[PDB]
Amino acid sequence: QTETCTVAPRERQNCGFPGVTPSQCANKGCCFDDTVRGVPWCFYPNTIL
């Protein structure tokens, strides 16, 4: 792996859309988390090393 879903919520950039599902987020190669408010559910991953 070269990408990680460990992103600070205030740094998460929107990768999806209103009502995006994990499957639609996985199709785009992005990360999903709806347990944090005020941030996009589907966001881009962070680069490692």
Author numbering: 1 to 49
Sentences from the paper on this structure:
The three human TFFs (TFF1, TFF2, and TFF3)1 are ubiquitous in mucosal environments. The trefoil domain is comprised of three loops (foils) formed by three disulfide bonds. TFF1 and TFF3 are disulfide-linked homo-dimers with each monomer possessing a single trefoil domain, while TFF2 is a single-chain protein with two trefoil domains.
Initial attempts to co-crystallise the TFFs and their cognate ligand were confounded by the exceptional solubility of these proteins. An alignment of all mammalian TFF sequences revealed that all TFF1 proteins utilise a disaccharide-binding Asn, while all TFF3 proteins retain an Asp. TFF1 operates in the low pH gastric mucosa, while TFF3 does not, which suggested that a ligand-binding Asn or Asp may impact the pH profile of the lectin activity. The structure also provides insights into how TFF1 might bind H. pylori in an α-glucosidase sensitive manner. The core oligosaccharide of many H. pylori strains bears a Glc-α-1,4-Gal-branch, while the N-acetyl group of GlcNAc-α-1,4-Gal bound to the TFFs is solvent exposed and makes no interactions with the peptide. Clearly, the Glc-α-1,4-Gal branch of H. pylori core glycans could be easily accommodated in the TFF binding site.
